[PDB]
Structures are given as structure tokens and as C-alpha cells.
């Protein structure tokens, strides 16, 4: 059944190198869903952060339609190994490092719906660059993004669009694996740009990270007040015993330095 | 089964010499599959009682492409999770008190996927925090008291004590 349906699709002349045809010659429209699993290692020094997500791409390839209207056949057939299919050569423009998960069987899923609609799902670990602004460092908010776009195909061949409903989703155990920050807001936007090689379509998801204050309250502010307050208890020592005053004023000043360091 | 580890952040198979796998095909058609895998899993921790806490770390296992109609996971009936004898000895900082074997099947946007989950419970060893934190702090507070026995005229001695013990206290916490 499934194995036969797949066989039928590729027994004919099918070229995974050839872009899927369109009715008006328009570009292949790729709908994108994105599921963040974990956001970790938010490096302020190198201004980057890591994040593992599930990319989900969906386009139409009439050449792959087997059931068409179907209603007598399976809704979709799972694409098995050894069958090539044209896929959007998407990459992450602001990715500095990236890995696919391949433990046991590779972590991918490809479905070929009867009408020719393809679903593509893949786990990807990324290390993205996120320029940060520390003007209010102790109490700041940063905005980190993931950019997704085609590398070779221009605006005439491939166009990205965020899924209509819930384009960006978060796994339930994300905020719990992110102890130092609070993921307050997320946004789903377009970053299509015009370059020297052409105009390339591009999506951009953005998360907003609010830095947790409890740490800085306890490790910075509290202990500094407690340090300044100590320098005051020397105002109550007799003006004759200066050794005591200097010892206080100097030790609290030195400690202040260390703390800041 | 195209199984993967949902909460795995990094994973390696061992391939020294011949790859570390074994596949048996029993006469009745039953297949056995055995493979060594090194993992780096995410384990959200809760430090409310940090010095004396217990964390619970898990390994999730599930199919990636096959849904609930094609593939269903079930823990072996007898001893689903086993530990090697030299495990606790290679884990000096904690004590692996309890383990559990559970199901984490979930309903996603791409379908309903079957999923297993093993869980180990790690109790943090106290001897270290007793010696490196509690003992030395008491020994530090107690020193600040020996200045109550110096004559009220020699304040330089009292301040020297009270301030040095306070500063040291800071460093230790840092």
C-alpha cells in the first residue's frame, strides 16, 4: 500500500533537483512552524545563546500527489529512506553553530499528503548570535532572534510565510530549564532583504528575555548596603580612637572593590 | 523504530573498532536491538533547599516520525531499568536513591506520539557542605564572640576580630 504509493510517485520521471511547478509560475510557498524546546547558555561576553528547536516546513509539490481527492486512500504516506524529494534549502542566517540530531535513526519526519502537500519536521540544535545591550545591565531585557531563509533560491522561486495559527510554540518545560531569565514575550516577523545576489525571503522569530533580579538583589545590592552601613558605625566611635575608624572605612572600601571586580 | 531522546541536547554512539551494536533475529521474527549511547540531557533543577536538596533527572525516549497508530513503546515487563554495579562509585557528589519507569506519551500538532520516561532521583551529598560551609561558618561566628572577653578599652582588638570575620564570611559565600 504505502510502499506501492511511494513506488508509483518515483517510478515516473521525478527530479528532486527541480523546484516544484506552480499554476501561475509563482514561487513555491513554504509555510513555517517553529517549536522551541530549550533556550540555554545565554553568553553575555560573546553575546550569543544556544537553543534547540523543531523546524516544521510545509509546501505543495503537485508531482508528489498520489491520492489527489483520495477518500479511498491513506491521507498521507510517510516518506521512507531512499526517496529523494525537493526541499527548501533553508538555513539560519544568524546561526554560528548548528547540529542535527541523529541518535539511532535521524530525527526527521517527512509526510507526503495525497494532494501533494509535504510536511517536514526536524530537530536542530543552534548557537545563535544575539547582540545584547547592557545599559541597565542588572535590570535589563534582551531580545534574541532566530532567522530563517533560503540560501540559493530567490524571491521568484521560494517564499516563506509563518503558519497562520500559532507559528511559534514553546515546550512546557522551557522556562524551567531557563533559571536565570524569564521569557516574557515572543514575536513572529519577516526579515526579507535585498542583497547583491538578489532578493531573499526571510522569517524571524524573537524571544524577549528579562533578567532575574533575585540574584543581583542578594549578591550585589544587599551586601553593598550592608557594606556602606558598616562604614557608618565608625561615626559612633570616639574621635580619639581613629585606628578603629580607619580599619572600618578602609576594609569596607577594599571589600567594595573586590565585590565589583 | 526511529527512536530519539526528546530531552537530549547532545548524543554519541560508540564506534571504537567495530560499532557497538547488536541485532538478533529470533526464529519467530522477534528482533533484539542493543546499542551503547552517550547522552547529555537537560534536567531542570530546583535549588530551594540547595545545600540539602534532591533533584530528579529523566531520560525521554520516543519515536520521531511514527505516530501512535504505527509504533507503541512499552517498558519491559521485568526490570525495565537496570544499573551497572559501578555507577554509584563513579558518582561521588550524589547518591542515586530512587528510580522510576513511566510513560510520557503526548498529543502534538503533528499527532499523538508514544513515549517512555525513566527517572533517577539524586540526593546531594552533605559531608562536603558540612565541612566547607557550615563548620567553618560556625567557627567564624564563634571567633566574633571571643571579642566579648576583651576589655572594653581595647576596641582595636574587637574591631579587628569583628571585621575580619565579617569580611571572611563574605568571601566564603562568594
Amino acid at each position: 500500500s504505502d510502499s506501492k504509493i511511494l513506488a508509483h510517485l518515483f517510478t515516473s520521471g521525478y527530479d528532486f533537483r527541480v523546484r516544484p511547478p506552480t499554476d501561475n509560475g509563482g514561487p513555491v510557498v513554504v509555510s513555517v512552524n517553529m517549536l522551541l524546546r530549550t533556550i540555554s547558555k545565554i553568553d553575555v561576553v560573546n553575546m550569543e545563546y544556544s537553543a534547540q528547536l523543531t523546524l516544521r516546513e510545509s509546501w505543495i509539490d503537485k508531482r508528489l500527489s498520489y491520492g489527489v481527492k483520495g477518500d479511498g486512500q491513506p491521507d498521507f504516506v510517510i516518506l521512507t529512506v531512499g526517496h529523494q524529494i525537493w526541499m527548501p534549502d533553508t538555513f539560519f542566517p544568524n546561526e554560528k553553530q548548528a547540529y542535527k540530531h541523529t541518535i539511532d535513526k535521524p530525527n526527521v519526519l517527512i509526510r507526503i499528503h495525497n494532494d501533494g502537500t509535504v510536511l517536514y519536521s526536524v530537530r536542530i540544535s543552534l548557537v545563535l548570535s544575539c547582540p545584547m545591550y547592557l545599559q541597565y545591565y542588572p535590570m535589563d531585557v534582551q531580545q534574541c532572534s532566530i532567522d530563517l531563509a533560503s540560501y540559493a533560491y530567490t524571491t521568484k522561486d521560494i517564499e516563506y510565510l509563518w503558519k497562520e495559527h500559532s507559528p511559534l510554540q514553546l515546550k512546557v518545560g522551557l522556562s524551567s530549564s531557563l533559571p536565570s531569565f524569564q521569557l516574557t514575550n515572543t514575536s513572529t516577523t519577516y526579515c526579507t532583504s535585498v542583497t547583491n545576489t538578489g532578493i531573499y525571503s526571510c522569517l524571524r522569530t524573537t524571544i524577549q528575555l528579562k533578567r532575574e533580579f533575585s540574584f543581583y538583589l542578594l549578591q550585589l545590592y544587599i551586601p553593598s548596603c550592608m557594606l556602606v552601613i558598616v562604614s557608618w558605625v565608625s561615626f559612633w566611635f570616639d574621635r580619639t580612637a581613629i585606628p578603629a575608624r580607619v580599619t572600618l572605612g578602609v576594609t569596607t572600601l577594599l571589600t567594595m572593590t573586590a565585590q565589583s571586580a | 523504530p526511529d527512536t530519539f531522546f526528546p530531552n537530549e541536547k547532545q548524543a554519541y554512539k560508540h564506534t571504537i573498532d567495530k560499532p557497538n551494536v547488536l541485532i538478533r533475529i529470533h526464529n519467530d521474527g522477534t528482533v533484539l536491538y542493543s546499542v551503547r549511547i552517550s547522552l547529555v540531557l537537560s534536567c531542570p533543577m530546583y535549588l530551594q533547599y540547595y545545600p540539602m536538596d534532591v533533584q530528579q533527572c529523566s531520560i525521554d525516549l520516543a519515536s520521531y516520525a511514527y505516530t501512535t497508530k504505527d509504533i507503541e513503546y512499552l517498558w519491559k515487563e521485568h526490570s525495565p531499568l537496570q544499573l551497572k554495579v559501578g555507577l554509584s562509585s563513579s558518582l561521588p557528589s550524589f547518591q542515586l536513591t530512587n528510580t522510576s519507569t513511566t510513560y510520557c506519551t503526548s498529543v502534538t500538532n503533528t499527532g499523538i506520539y508514544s513515549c517512555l520516561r525513566t527517572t533517577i532521583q539524586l540526593k546531594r551529598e552533605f559531608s562536603f557542605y558540612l565541612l566547607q560551609l557550615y563548620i567553618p561558618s560556625c567557627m567564624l561566628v564563634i571567633v566574633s564572640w571571643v571579642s566579648f572577653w576583651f576589655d572594653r578599652t581595647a576596641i582595636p582588638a574587637r574591631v579587628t576580630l569583628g571585621v575580619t570575620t565579617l569580611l571572611t564570611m563574605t568571601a566564603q559565600s562568594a
Partner: antibody, heavy 122, light 110 residues
């Protein structure tokens, strides 16, 4: 105590479409997935489908594929069910039944609603 | 397609032990059927009892218990009570959907 309160009874003409609700309270709404069960005079209980509040995800009985549309409104802790192209056969009592497990699918029923009686007659 | 079968009705006295059974037409009820048991009191009051692997609903009395006696799903009430008189539906999971039985009308003789 958890409670699932469904909308009142409805009377609608064939060809039309109406939507019944299931307001959940007494538990973290987004943690448990919701089932919809149809009890008709003509037959036994039928399982329509289920939806995961947290996820948005849904899974329908092949039978009701296109007849029912499960949705969820997180803000109000309510689960809704659309019923399209209503006919005589759609005249039944529709229950909503919560799944047992916390932020995971356990395949077992907890609490049901009082049911919603839908009457489709021209 | 697949059909679930139950006893039309059963009778039992307060304190005794009754057992309802749930039969699959395609074959023996296995663990991947996740046999569920639902109770229906008068006036359309549904509540779950057992289901999934070997878990039960919040509050389900200890007298209720599930098992796979023979080659079908069972629901055993050890020490039947007056209030235990209701209609019991069992549901089997077939691949991607639930299929309910006809229901068994348990009567506690008073």
C-alpha cells in the same frame, strides 16, 4: 474540586451549524487534554476527538473528520466544539471528558460534563 | 469494523464480588487497547474508573480494579456497594480512536 460545565440545550434546523462549550474550573486548564463523546439514542457512545489545550493539537475520529472542529480558549479555560452541516443524525447528547494525566496523554477518563443536548429538527 | 461487546446486564448483592468483561471483535484485548471503564449514574452522570496502562481516576474507590482475565478486559468490584449500581461502559483503543461497548447494567439487589 474540578468541574466541567457545558453550554445549555440547543435547537437548530438542518444545514445549520452550532457550537457547544465546556468551561473548566478547579484545575490548571492547560494541563489536561479534553475528549468529546457523543451519546445518541440510535447507537452507543461514540468518541469524536480530543484536543490538547496547551498545545492546540487535535486528533479526530475518522468518522467525525469534518463534522466536528475542536478548539480551545486558554484565557477563559473553555473548550469548544463546532458541528457543521447539522442533520437528523446529529441529534444527540454531547459530553466532554477530561484526560487523566498532567501535561501528558494518559488515555483514561477523569471527569465528564453534565452533557449538552442538541436537537436538530426542521 | 471493530466492535466492543459487554454483558447486557448483571446482578449482585451488597458485599459480593461481581466482574464485568469487555470483548474485542478483532481479537484478544491487549495492553495497547488501553481498556477504559466509565460509570454512568442516573441523570447522565459519567465518571471514569480505570484506563491507560494501569492508572485510575482521582477518587475511584479501592474496590474497583482492572485486569486482562482470559483474552478480554475485566472490571472487578470487590465488595459491591448500593451506590455501585449504574451502567458501566468499557472503551477500547484501536490504533487512533476509541470504540465504546454496549454497556453493562449492574444491579445491586436491594
Amino acid at each position: 474540586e474540578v468541574q466541567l460545565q457545558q453550554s445549555g440545550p440547543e435547537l437548530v434546523r438542518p444545514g445549520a451549524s452550532m457550537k457547544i462549550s465546556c468551561k473548566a474550573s478547579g484545575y490548571s486548564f492547560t494541563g489536561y487534554t479534553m475528549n468529546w463523546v457523543k451519546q445518541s439514542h440510535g447507537k452507543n457512545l461514540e468518541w469524536i476527538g480530543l484536543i490538547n489545550p496547551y498545545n492546540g493539537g487535535t486528533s479526530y475520529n475518522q468518522k467525525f473528520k469534518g463534522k466536528a472542529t475542536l478548539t480551545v480558549d486558554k484565557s477563559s479555560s473553555t473548550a469548544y466544539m463546532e458541528l457543521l452541516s447539522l442533520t437528523s443524525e446529529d441529534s444527540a447528547v454531547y459530553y466532554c471528558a477530561r484526560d487523566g494525566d498532567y501535561y501528558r496523554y494518559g488515555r483514561y477518563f477523569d471527569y465528564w460534563g453534565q452533557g449538552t443536548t442538541l436537537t436538530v429538527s426542521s | 469494523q471493530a466492535v466492543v461487546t459487554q454483558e447486557s446486564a448483571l446482578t449482585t448483592s451488597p458485599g459480593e464480588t461481581v466482574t464485568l468483561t469487555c470483548r474485542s471483535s478483532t481479537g484478544a484485548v491487549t495492553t495497547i487497547n488501553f481498556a477504559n471503564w466509565v460509570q454512568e449514574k442516573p441523570d447522565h452522570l459519567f465518571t471514569g474508573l480505570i484506563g491507560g496502562i494501569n492508572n485510575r481516576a482521582p477518587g475511584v474507590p479501592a474496590r474497583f480494579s482492572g485486569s486482562l482475565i482470559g483474552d478480554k478486559a475485566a472490571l472487578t468490584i470487590t465488595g459491591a456497594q448500593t451506590e455501585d449500581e449504574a451502567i458501566y461502559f468499557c472503551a477500547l483503543w484501536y490504533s487512533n480512536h476509541w470504540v465504546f461497548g454496549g454497556g453493562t447494567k449492574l444491579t445491586v439487589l436491594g
